[PDB]
Amino acid sequence: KVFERCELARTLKRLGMDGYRGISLANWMCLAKWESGYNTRATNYNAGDRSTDYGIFQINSRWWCNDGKTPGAVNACHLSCSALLQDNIADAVACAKRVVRDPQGIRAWVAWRNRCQNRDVRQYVQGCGV
Numbered sequence: 001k002v003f004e005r006c007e008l009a010r011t012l013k014r015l016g017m018d019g020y021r022g023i024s025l026a027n028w029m030c031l032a033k034w035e036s037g038y039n040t041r042a043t044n045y046n047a048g049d050r051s052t053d054y055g056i057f058q059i060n061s062r063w064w065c066n067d068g069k070t071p072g073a074v075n076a077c078h079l080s081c082s083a084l085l086q087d088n089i090a091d092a093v094a095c096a097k098r099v100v101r102d103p104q105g106i107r108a109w110v111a112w113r114n115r116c117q118n119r120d121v122r123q124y125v126q127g128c129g130v
Contacts, residue, residue, distance in 0.1 A: 001087040003038040003056075005029070006128035013130050015093045021100045028096075029124035030116035031109055032056050040092070041085055055084035055092045057099075058109070064095055 003011070009029055012018070018025040035058040036042035044053040051062040051070045061070040065081040077095035084092045099108055106112050 001040050003032075003040075005033075005038065005124070006130070008032065008038050009125050009128040009130045011089065012093065015090060017093060017097075018130075020097055021105060023100060023106050024121075025130060026121040026125045027106060027112070027116060030119075030121040031106065031112045033124060034111045034115045035109065040087055040089060043085070052081070054081045055086075056089055057084075057092055057096050058111075059084055059092065059095055059099065064099060 009025060012025055012028055017023075017028050032038050035053075036056050038056060040056045042053075042055060042058060044058060046052065049062065049071075051060055052067060053060050054065060054067075059065055059077070061067045061081050062072055063074050064077045065079045065084055066073055066075040067081040077098045079091060079095055084095065086092075100106055102108065107117075
């Protein structure tokens with residue numbers, strides 16, 4: 001499913017992401033925009049280390065979800081990677097909460113450091129009534 005911007009903002013709000021480990025909703029919205037363009041079906045295979053990034057947050061199969069074909073997989077979210085390609089994002093959100101409980105927090109996603117850190121990200125939630 002490709003979410004509309006404010007549709008996603010209200011869904012993340014309902015799922016308890018606003019201020020989760022000190023991370024505002026606008027920061028989570030900036031991350032989903034640049035990771036997938038708010039598309040739950042997004043996958044990206046990384047040929048160099050043989051891992052794939054899944055779903056709206058592009059969560060990686062080496063560390064977080066299990067797809068059975070990645071070398072060294074840890075599966076810290078204890079989730080099948082197919083659970084991150086659903087239209088329903090409650091599982092992708094429970095795994096994203098797990099990722100940021102590590103000390104790096106949202107910095108775990110490089111795309112957040114490149115496109116969202118130290119920028120004004122408030123336009124991602126403006127007008128959504130969130």
